[PDB]
Enzyme design. Structure first.
Site, PDB file in Angstrom:
ATOM      1  CG  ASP A   1      28.347  37.686  16.857  1.00 24.32           C
ATOM      2  OD1 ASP A   1      28.271  38.329  15.793  1.00 24.32           O
ATOM      3  OD2 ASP A   1      29.121  37.994  17.784  1.00 24.32           O
TER       4      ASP A   1
ATOM      5  CG  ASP B   1      30.731  44.902  17.583  1.00 24.71           C
ATOM      6  OD1 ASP B   1      29.689  44.515  17.019  1.00 24.71           O
ATOM      7  OD2 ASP B   1      31.703  44.150  17.820  1.00 24.71           O
TER       8      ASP B   1
END
Ligand SMILES: *[C@@H]1O[C@H](CO)[C@@H](O[C@@H]2O[C@H](CO)[C@@H](O)[C@H](O)[C@H]2NC(C)=O)[C@H](O)[C@H]1NC(C)=O
Ligand SMILES: *[C@@H]1O[C@H](CO)[C@@H](O[C@@H]2O[C@H](CO)[C@@H](O)[C@H](O)[C@H]2NC(C)=O)[C@H](O)[C@H]1NC(C)=O
Ligand SMILES: *[C@@H]1O[C@H](CO)[C@@H](O)[C@H](O)[C@H]1NC(C)=O
Ligand SMILES: *[C@@H]1O[C@H](CO)[C@@H](O)[C@H](O)[C@H]1NC(C)=O
Ligand SMILES: *[C@@H]1O[C@H](CO)[C@@H](O)[C@H](O)[C@H]1NC(C)=O
Ligand SMILES: *[C@@H]1O[C@H](CO)[C@@H](O)[C@H](O)[C@H]1NC(C)=O
Lengths: 388, 388
Positions: free
Chosen positions: B140, B201
């Site tokens: 990430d 997301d």
């Protein structure tokens, strides 16, 4: 409307949302608008447990009539799609202990392009429907001016009464006028109609449901006070069992329509309905709350920053219904609060039943904290009864 | 990334969308992020037919580590939630013929607030993961500057290789930089990563899926050319089996992710998944198309005013896949066209199989008209093979 009808929100099936104006009976024998569709839905309602729960109306919407009135100036059903006529369809439905609803439009044309009920045709059409054995009439408002509607809607109420046949009268008048005062006078509507479509047509999607929920609750101050036995607000058809709603979303529409004391008019194919969708629509306690004798429409009482909304509806027997709604899109959410925080009487205790799970809480004190877990786009609904 | 891995889009299960950062194992023993969650999902994949279909990755996402590195400066899993350590979890997964994926963040902190992998920790963390027996790593990009990411992502690719252990490398680098050129260099990404999250997301709702579908297809010109064996675009997790998608919508995500040659990483509770959701995710032909050896990402080729969109993906064996997508909210829609109109070779014939229904069309000529009926928010997907 004081005609002894719709003392509770009308329950039944309505063709429009799911089947629309499909007249292709050659390729869609089962999904096309024809006498067969209504007869089969009637069998479904009569055989699959719907009738016993209260679902009694089988309603025809737009696109049922011939493209023109007969020579005598009367409305007639489409010859190929309704070969036995309306009266025969009504008898068939009646023989099952159900009721038949029909559709008309106060104006030059129905929204779908079929013969409209102009002012000079109101008495005749009301007369035609009664003779056929019609039990409910939804009067749409395409192709008519506000002035014509102000005259026609009250006029049709009078015409229906004159036939001597009790007919539930559903009016779309408010929707065409924006649904809000001063343009709309809900006191007048209550006097002339049994129910009225206040807002936009529901489409098969969650956003459509949310759009309807938000408009009605945002404007609840000018809508909630005018609903009651004999005259209801109508947020439109239930789309549970169709293409756009997930399971949680389906449970949400049923719960919120119940909080709104909305008609429970299903528009789905009862021949292919899923077990889960059926289980939602047949929930007895849910139906009892929707059908509560007092007819007091509920309201949204809380809008949390957590994206949780809370609704409350006062009921008979000093009971209440609460709906905890999650509009979050992340995960199940733990909402913690107390009845006291929600506004309930101090030092009291309630027997609580979860409407969907059946789980019961024996004696919840108003001062005690409790937590409910709500899934994304879903609800947790409670039925509360005070202890003494 | 030429590490011999991800020659086809990765298939498996990923914890994030469905379970998020739930660390309340006391009240959510089954839904909390713990070693038990991964072991049970591993059993599910190994026992319910998933493994045979190709689903092999069991991936841990954010919130698995201790709030701080040990004294030696190494990452360690949360003591209470992962009492047997990662290596043991890996062995367990490995014993089932599956693979274990883990999560890290190039930056000072993970997006969830856990220990981040700063530049001085890259080699050590890559080393720690290999020793544990890790097979995949999602890196990430919260709390790191663009300059730090430009250095760190390529740096981690090198570190992983040095451990000598083949590890699928999933990079979120593009998403933090906006996902588009010139800020993002997809040629470089292809050299250093096996797959990359380009955009936002996914959340548990149909609008989230549509938002992702629209961004990827609107920008397909700068994305489609850079996908291929060993390096894929990643539109995020499949949310089929969760709370926000209807049946038709679930079928739509599976079909569109397949057109995009996207990883098939499920994020749902495999212990409670519904039969219909399972049937969608286990569709063999769908998986074959997603896993096509050529790895040529498909594109949207048509956007009708009827709110119908058409997608095409070229495949091996001179085959093709077509997806007819309806974004209408009214009713099933009849889309009529011909392969010729869609752009296929003249005077040819194809054997067509409906991916979801299994129905076959023996020899469809490119010049022949055909009609497909698409439900609201749903699709009709075809697998086409030329005849000779
Ligand atoms: C026409 O209107 C009259 C009232 O104006 C309706 O009669 C009422 O019926 C309800 C329920 O049956 C009673 O509670 C009221 O007491 C009645 N009012 C009067 C003045 O008698 C009558 O039902 C209507 N007719 C039709 C066919 O709808
Ligand atoms: C480190 O990188 C090398 C290449 O730089 C990888 O070796 C390649 O492996 C693939 C598949 O096994 C082969 O097709 C190539 O021919 C190899 N290239 C070379 C230069 O030998 C190696 O797999 C990487 N190591 C790890 C652990 O990822
Ligand atoms: C609304 O209609 C009722 C019933 O006819 C009437 O008494 C009232 O005056 C109307 N309100 C307004 C603002 O015109
Ligand atoms: C009840 O829960 C609230 C959280 O919503 C908390 O602030 C409050 O202190 C709790 N009351 C008690 C007595 O624990
Ligand atoms: C993108 O990265 C590749 C690989 O390092 C490089 O060859 C190319 O020059 C870069 N493109 C730009 C515009 O910098
Ligand atoms: C094929 O269908 C199209 C409608 O999309 C129509 O315009 C065309 O005339 C048809 N071709 C034939 C040969 O019927």
């Amino acid at each position: 409307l004081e005609n002894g009808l719709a003392r509770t929100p009308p329950m039944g099936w309505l063709a429009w949302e799911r089947f629309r104006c499909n007249v292709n009976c050659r390729e869609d024998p089962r999904q096309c608008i024809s006498e067969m569709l209504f007869m089969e839905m009637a069998d479904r309602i009569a055989e699959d447990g719907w009738r016993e729960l209260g679902y009694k109306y089988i309603n025809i919407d737009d696109c049922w009539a011939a493209k023109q009135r007969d020579a005598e100036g009367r409305l007639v059903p489409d010859p190929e799609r309704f070969p036995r006529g309306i009266k025969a369809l009504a008898d068939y439905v009646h023989a099952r202990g159900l009721k038949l609803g029909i559709y008309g439009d106060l104006g030059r044309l129905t929204c779908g392009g079929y013969p409209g009920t102009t002012l000079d045709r109101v008495e005749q059409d009301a007369q035609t429907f009664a003779e056929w054995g019609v039990d409910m009439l939804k009067l749409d408002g395409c192709y008519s001016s506000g002035k014509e509607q102000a005259q026609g809607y009250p006029q049709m109420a009078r015409a229906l009464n004159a036939t001597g046949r009790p007919i539930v009268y559903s009016c779309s008048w408010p929707a065409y006028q924006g649904g809000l005062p001063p343009k709309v006078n809900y006191t007048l509507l209550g006097e002339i109609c049994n129910l009225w479509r206040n807002y936009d047509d529901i489409q098969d999607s969650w956003d459509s449901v949310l759009s309807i929920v938000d408009w009605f609750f945002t404007n609840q101050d000018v809508l909630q006070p005018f609903a009651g036995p004999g005259h209801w607000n109508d947020p439109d058809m239930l789309i549970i069992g169709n293409f756009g709603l997930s399971y949680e979303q389906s449970r949400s529409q049923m719960a919120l329509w119940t909080i709104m004391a909305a008609p429970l008019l299903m528009s789905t194919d009862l021949r292919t309905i899923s077990p889960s969708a059926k289980k939602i629509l047949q929930n007895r306690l849910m139906i009892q709350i929707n059908q509560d004798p007092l007819g007091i429409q509920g309201r949204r009482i809380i809008k949390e920053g957590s994206h949780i909304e809370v609704f409350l509806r006062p009921l008979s027997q000093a009971a209440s219904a609460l709906v905890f709604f999650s509009r979050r899109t992340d995960m199940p959410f733990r909402y913690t609060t107390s009845l006291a925080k929600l506004g309930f009487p101090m030092g009291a205790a309630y027997e609580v039943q979860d409407v969907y799970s059946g789980k019961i809480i024996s004696g919840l004190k108003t001062g005690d904290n409790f937590t409910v877990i709500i899934n994304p786009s879903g609800v947790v609904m409670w039925y509360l009864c005070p202890k003494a």
